[PDB]
Amino acid sequence: GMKVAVLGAAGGIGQALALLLKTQLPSGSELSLYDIAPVTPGVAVDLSHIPTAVKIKGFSGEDATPALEGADVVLISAGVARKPDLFNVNAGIVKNLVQQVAKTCPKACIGIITNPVNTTVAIAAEVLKKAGVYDKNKLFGVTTLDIIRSNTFVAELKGKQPGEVEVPVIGGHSGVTILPLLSQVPGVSFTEQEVADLTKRIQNAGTEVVEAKAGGGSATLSMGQAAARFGLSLVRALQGEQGVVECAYVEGDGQYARFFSQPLLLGKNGVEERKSIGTLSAFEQNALEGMLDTLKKDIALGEEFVN
Amino acid sequence: GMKVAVLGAAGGIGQALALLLKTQLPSGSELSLYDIAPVTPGVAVDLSHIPTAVKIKGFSGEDATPALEGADVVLISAGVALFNVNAGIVKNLVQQVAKTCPKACIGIITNPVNTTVAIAAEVLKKAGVYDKNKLFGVTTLDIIRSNTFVAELKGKQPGEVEVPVIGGHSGVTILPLLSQVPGVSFTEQEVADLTKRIQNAGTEVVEAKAGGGSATLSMGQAAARFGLSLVRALQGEQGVVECAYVEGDGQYARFFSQPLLLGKNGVEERKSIGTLSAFEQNALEGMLDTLKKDIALGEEFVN
């Protein structure tokens, strides 16, 4: 059966992700949880009492190898969560875990959730290259939280059903690199003021969470849901479902930057097709040009950490 | 347009329950979160970014009223996941239910359920609003554990196994009716071993967590299953059956968990526990005194 490993499973994001995967992965799947914290085997035992046909086991300590054996998908959510310096703490965590993936399940698809995604995916790529196992079609920066936020905010503004709205989001995963393509939402039109306001809201949405928590936490549950949506889409594609499309941050043709988020057709090899970003409005063209320097610097930060 | 209030929403159980309800309640539902923890408004904002047609708002401070206004279902998962701590919390919150949404269905998740449901009933009776068809001790975790363990032992698909569980929610008061699992027979030894495992399954989790926590995610899932079943029945679905701990006819104890047909006013019919095996009959007789003491503890706390 299809095996998914979650590295970082003891944190708030990882536990939410693990709950959603235990309850939504296809029958016959396997789920392995890993984190440093010794609670992790018991997080898995907790989830193992839920009557779905998903086998689940958990592991703790310094070695992620037993969770990674036979993994088809590896989701990495370890490290410090973003609360809108992060590179300073998470860079080594990502490098250590991707080194273990490269040794144990180098053919797995790898979803990097750990932030800053724009940089940590570049770290992962250079680690995999140094190990001689890098497959650009199998390494993803998980940007899905930007998409599900965009869907929610567009649906609310325009009175649509939220589950029926799908906004393409391109670029990167932080600040001005997040570009929602509002001009492409079918059946919906936006004034230029609505576009500027919605784009700013999407680019700063995590601050709504932090402020409403009075500084006491981050957006853990919606990040778990976004990561679960991405992981479940990847599993559906790896099992042969057709037409599975997700935006994610991947190494592409390099037209805008070495790594860039765009709509992807997924398949049994990971990325099946990098789809065109399409026709952009004047606002979107300016936003795209405006964040290229930032995105390239984010990428170089990760490349230079390894090399 | 059903509205569900979760009291205790900032804890581990509450956040898992809230995530599952935000993603699974019918389109057009409303979800309110309340917890004295100051993070709670932001737990709701976090969940509000998920694109489902479920309006969600969170509330803190001492006043649960804004979360309870218009609520059709109130799930209480507040407190420590001990008795004197949780007893006062349940009394406080059920008082607020009594004053704000006295016709809501109330699901008590806060443990010890055998006792905290009795506290809730006595609070509601004092306020003059009690409806024994609308107060439930949520025992669903015992059922989904039983389903998991039976399916593994017998090589069944876990989602196709449903085990009735009767009695109470702790220790020897948990009685899984393995004799009633359709298409499956168990040896005497299998019954003994499965019953012991089900009665002590929480300790499995505590020990595997190296003493660093309790069952939170499976309790969230069990509470979500119960809450979603209740919402379905309140919206007119026929044939929705769940085991839960309720004030019934008193044949065995004042409060007792048995299969319930749910409906538009909460309990529609308290179903018979059926025919019991010799093992099940002895287990039922053996825990009645414990269950009655659990109930009296809750009654005395209020009275």
Compile the SSE list and pairings.
The structure is a homodimer.
Chain A: E1 3-7, H1 12-24, E2 29-34, H2 40-48, E3 54-59, H3 65-68, E4 73-76, H4 86-104, E5 109-112, H5 117-130, E6 139-141, H6 144-158, E7 169-171, E8 178-180, H7 192-203, H8 205-212, H9 220-238, E9 245-251, E10 259-267, E11 270-274, H10 282-290, H11 292-306
PDB class: cytosolic protein
Keywords: Dehydrogenase, cytosolic protein
Assembly: dimeric
Q: Any overview of this molecule?
A:
Two copies of one chain form a homodimer. Chain A has 307 residues and is an alpha/beta fold. Chain A contains eleven helices and eleven strands. Chain A has a six-stranded parallel beta sheet, sandwiched between helices. A three-stranded antiparallel beta sheet of chain A has the order 9-10-11. The first copy, chain A, has a two-stranded antiparallel sheet with strand order 7-8. Chains A and B meet through helix 1, helix 2, helix 6, helix 8 and helix 9 of A and helix 1, helix 2, helix 6, helix 8 and helix 9 of B. It is classed as cytosolic protein. Keywords: Dehydrogenase, cytosolic protein.
Task: Quickly list its features.
EC 1.1.1.37 (chain A); globular; L-2-Hydroxyisocaproate Dehydrogenase, Chain A, domain 2; homodimer; Rossmann fold; alpha/beta; 307 residues
Based on CA atoms alone, the radius of gyration of chain A comes out at 18 Å
Largest interface: A-B, 51 and 50 residues
Q: Strand-and-helix sequence of chain A, N→C?
A: EHEHEHEHEHEHEEHHHEEEHH
Total count of strands of chain A: 11
The quaternary organization reads as: homodimer
By DSSP (H or I, 4+ residues per run), the number of helices of chain A equals: 11
Helix percent of chain A reads 40-55%
Return the domain count of chain A: 2
CATH architecture of the largest domain in chain A: Alpha-Beta Complex
Beta-strand content bin of chain A: 15-25%
Roughly how many Å apart are the termini of chain A? 37 Å
CATH topology of the largest domain in chain A, anyone? L-2-Hydroxyisocaproate Dehydrogenase, Chain A, domain 2
**Could you give me the name of the CATH homologous superfamily of the largest domain in chain A?**
Lactate dehydrogenase/glycoside hydrolase, family 4, C-terminal
Question: Main sheet of chain A, how many strands, which sense, barrel?
Answer: 6 strands, parallel
Structural class of chain A: alpha/beta
Output the CATH class name of the largest domain in chain A: Alpha Beta
Please state the overall shape of chain A, judged from the principal axes of the Cα atoms: globular
Q: Largest sheet of chain A, order of strands side by side?
A: 3-2-1-4-5-6
Family (chain A): Belongs to the LDH/MDH superfamily. MDH type 1 family.
Binding site for substrate (chain A): 82, 115, 149
GO molecular function, one term (chain A): oxidoreductase activity
Protein name (chain A): Malate dehydrogenase
